[PDB]
Amino acid sequence: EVPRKLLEEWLAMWSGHYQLKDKLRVQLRPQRAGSEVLELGIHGESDDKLANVIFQPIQDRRGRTILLVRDQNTFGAELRQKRLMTLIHLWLVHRFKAQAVHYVTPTDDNLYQTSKMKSHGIFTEVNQEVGEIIVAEVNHPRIAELLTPDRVALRKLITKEA
Structure with a gap:
């Protein structure tokens, strides 16, 4: 069971570093009453x-979980350019045991973030598919590395050393 507190602990290190x-x-x-669409808010x-991040966890025919992302935002300008959305997605992928993250609208900001998160390693492959959606396949070894309890790789992600 993956608590919100885990992301809060990461964000404490991150906020402090920056x-x-x-x-x-x-x-x-x-995201609203009765909905299966969720909202992660910081x-x-x-x-x-x-x-x-506004998203819905769904399953395919084979029982694999995909996070379908409707919207993501970094509203506070001071929080940008610091890998915040990578940390959020790392937590979401772990929380939901996701195999992939699909963005339903290929906005400039969604193209930017998915490309950037690929460069941080949390996705192996990012491509646009039929319907214009962005499909990002999870890099399971990198996720596992970042979740190591010693937090060494995670701290290096936060500081941009690795």
Whole structure:
């Protein structure tokens, strides 16, 4: 069972490294009442939503989980260019045991983020497919490396050493 607290621990190291304010909190709820679409939100001490991912975990015929991402944002400008969305996706992939992440709209920002996350290693392959969607296959060995309890690889991701 993968708690929100794990991402909060990562974000504590990250916020500290980048000399940002502390107390980033993780919320994961249905995006609206009764929905199976979820929203992961990152909130600051005054509850402002500083980043989010709106997505739905689904399964294919073979029982594999895909995260279908409707929207992602880094709202707070000071939080950008620091691999925040990589950390969020690392957590989401682990939480849902995802095999792939599909982005339903190929916006410039979604193309940017998927390409960048591939360069961080969390995806092996990123391509646009029929329907214009972006399909990103999870790099299971890299995910496992980053989740190692010693947090060495994870700290190096945070600082941009690796």
